């Protein structure tokens, strides 16, 4: 009966690109939600299927932690029922979501003076992601009626594109590390309690 490892997913040094978003499963542990309410640093903390404060005295079968980096102006898309480029082609929550979305500004870490180009978003996809899908393909997107045959050009576009995170950007285009906790409830016996 040892701790839940939220310190290694929240306090982690390197963060995924949103299109290739990371996922840490959380099983068989006792969860100190204290580190969430006592943080000051979070810019977002909306919960969905649960009451945000009662997290302590609650029990779950499995908890999942998803981490990635987006713009400030995009955090409003990491929430059930939202649409748009991130929600449609990078990371969608079910409508029946039960969990908490957490974010915080990371301009000081994830920006660089010439722009940090490590962090990527998918700009093109033929279909909206289904919820919790992850698409890491790098095929050339075919906007035209003729095949691209492995050559980018007119109507033939690489599907990923980079944020140009410079520290001088407006808040809208500053980076924000995001953590999405999924509280899974299965008929099987619980393993994540307080």
């Amino acid at each position, epitope marked *: 009966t040892n701790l839940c490892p939220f310190g290694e997913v929240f306090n982690a040094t390197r963060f995924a690109s949103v299109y290739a978003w990371n996922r840490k499963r959380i099983s068989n542990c006792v969860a100190d939600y204290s580190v969430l309410y006592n943080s000051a640093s979070f810019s977002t903390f909306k919960c969905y299927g649960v009451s945000p404060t009662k997290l302590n005295d609650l029990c779950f079968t499995n908890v999942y932690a998803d981490s990635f980096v987006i713009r400030g*102006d995009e955090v409003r898309q990491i929430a059930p029922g939202q649409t748009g480029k991130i929600a449609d082609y990078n990371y969608k929550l079910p409508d029946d979501f039960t969990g908490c979305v957490i974010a915080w500004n990371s301009n000081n870490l994830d920006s660089k003076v010439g722009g940090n180009y490590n962090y990527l978003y998918r700009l093109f996809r033929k279909s909206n992601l289904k919820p919790f899908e992850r698409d890491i393909s790098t095929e050339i997107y075919q*906007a035209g009626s003729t095949p691209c045959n492995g050559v980018e050009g007119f*109507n033939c576009y690489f599907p990923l594109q980079s944020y140009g995170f410079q520290p001088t950007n407006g808040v809208g285009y500053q980076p924000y590390r995001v953590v999405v906790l999924s509280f899974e409830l299965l008929h099987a016996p619980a393993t994540v309690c307080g």
Partner: antibody
Amino acid sequence: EVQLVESGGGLIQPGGSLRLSCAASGFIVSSNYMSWVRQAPGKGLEWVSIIYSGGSTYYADSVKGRFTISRDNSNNTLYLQMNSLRAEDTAVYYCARALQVGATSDYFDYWGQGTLVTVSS
Amino acid sequence: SVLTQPPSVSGAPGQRVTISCTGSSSNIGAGYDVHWYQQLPGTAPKLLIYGNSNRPSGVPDRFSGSKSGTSASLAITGLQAEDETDYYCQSCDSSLSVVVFGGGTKLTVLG
């Protein structure tokens, strides 16, 4: 190789309805950010609606609830159903492919010729 | 008109005219890039510059662009009379998540 040809515009009573069509060739509409931008006679440009490659739609606040952007794979066509037309809806309606490929914001890199909508009694 | 451009600018052939586009912290100051379109009256707009400064294929190196803080600028060097048309800038605004256009600029070629 590539073309956008709009039609459907005319003269309509205020309150009436109309469906604009934008036939494409070269572009597969269903695979593109497609958009309607309009321009009142003698006046500037105003975006109207967009539809995302995966199907999401958005609208200028002036037309929200009145206008509907859809597309057809069979006809390879973009449509704009305009209901409850007001006088201020009078303009030339353009069909455009939208891209964000070198930028942080979307732009319209290929445009059709425009179809004229005149709402008056 | 969200973005703001001069109603008109003038130049003689061979000169260098610039057309400004000033926005705010909800668009250009938010980090949404600026784009520039040319429209001859009676015709359809044509993408001239995208992403602040890139030229689509088919646009002569005469046209260039730039963006600083909340303003952006279209430079036309070696002005020719075929450039006697209307110019529009365009960005996106985050206050109202809607793409916004400048008001337009009519370029008159003199001399």
